[PDB]
Amino acid sequence: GIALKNVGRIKKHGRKHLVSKNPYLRLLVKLYNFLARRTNANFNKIIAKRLIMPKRYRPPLSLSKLQYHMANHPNDIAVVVGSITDDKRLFSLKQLKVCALRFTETARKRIEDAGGECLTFDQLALKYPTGKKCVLLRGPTKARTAEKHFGKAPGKPKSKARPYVRSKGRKFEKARGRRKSRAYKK
Amino acid sequence: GKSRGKRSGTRYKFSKKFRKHGECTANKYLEKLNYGDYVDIVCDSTQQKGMPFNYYHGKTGKIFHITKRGVGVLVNKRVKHRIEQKKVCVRIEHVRKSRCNEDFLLRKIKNAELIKEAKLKNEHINIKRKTEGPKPAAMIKVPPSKIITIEPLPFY
């Protein structure tokens, strides 16, 4: 015998393949794997990796944050591997160039009315093979509500986690263990 | 039943040494402390206010709080599969400036001038410490009249 850990076998931890059976997405994965391999640019590698991630790691990005992130990058291209949504809290939109996976109808209409354009990834692969003057962006990955229940258990000292409750009110879990008046707080 | 008090098992730990009783000197009250310093926790039993707990007697930490007569110290402690940071609040008599750091400080100060001189003459300097190694050869002079012969001894 011999004294190795994990019998000498190396370990990896992430997702290895697509789960989705959409044929257009499979064509995209083939294309960008080829680009990443034959032009190792650290731009095509990251893209080829990101379009394999599950849904919870491809969050949406709104128009207002898109414009705010590109405020000091005029005449550049923003790249997102999620969806763009409209934002009714914006009053005015600039002229922008954006590539992404999906656009909502309202956001697509608003972008084109201000003089910009929307691109798909097979067009950015054709005009920007190595991602010159392209800026990679992503949306909030820890804003989902499910994340508000994770972490330290609600009942440990100074935990911010939400509990799982039938409903909300003065009659639902607010008496003993939540105020000093009933034997202790938290 | 079982008896686990706060001062249990400290009969010899918390006792003064021979012919060395009495309260502390007056210069102990003139020591300087600053944030981030290394410090030793040594309980002094003749001051009963703000004594540390049994476990921490003899440990070393860093300062995270200074008050009128108190100091907060960050100390590691092993709990069963991990190490936890503990926040220990003690009074000023049970506190001593740590000496575990001084060789590094002297080394830095002294190596500064050697580097400055070597670069001033544009030499090549090596400043890392050297582990004790094998010894070289030498020629040892010895008169024949000085070698004494020995042999095992009989039993008595």
């Binding site: - | 995270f64 709080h65 200074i66 008050t67 590691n76 092993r78 069963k80 599969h81 991990r82 190490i83 936890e84 940071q85």
Partner: protein, 66 residues
């Protein structure tokens, strides 16, 4: 019938299976309950510094774009 009542046999093999973990080494910690009358003054110092910095930056922007 009686039984065992204590042993910590096999406990540090379990402890070393996932090693002895260590603290996290952050750069800042919270000053919630620490020495007051010193951190309130620090709040004032930092507000003054930020005011000066922002005013200079804003003035530079104002003249640069004209």
């Amino acid at each position: 019938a009686k039984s065992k009542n204590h042993t910590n046999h096999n406990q540090n093999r379990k402890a070393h299976k996932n090693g002895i973990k260590k603290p996290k080494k952050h750069k800042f910690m919270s000053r919630k309950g620490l020495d007051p009358n010193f951190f309130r003054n620090q709040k004032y110092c930092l507000k003054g510094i930020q005011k000066k910095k922002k005013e200079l930056k804003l003035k530079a922007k104002q003249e640069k774009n004209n």
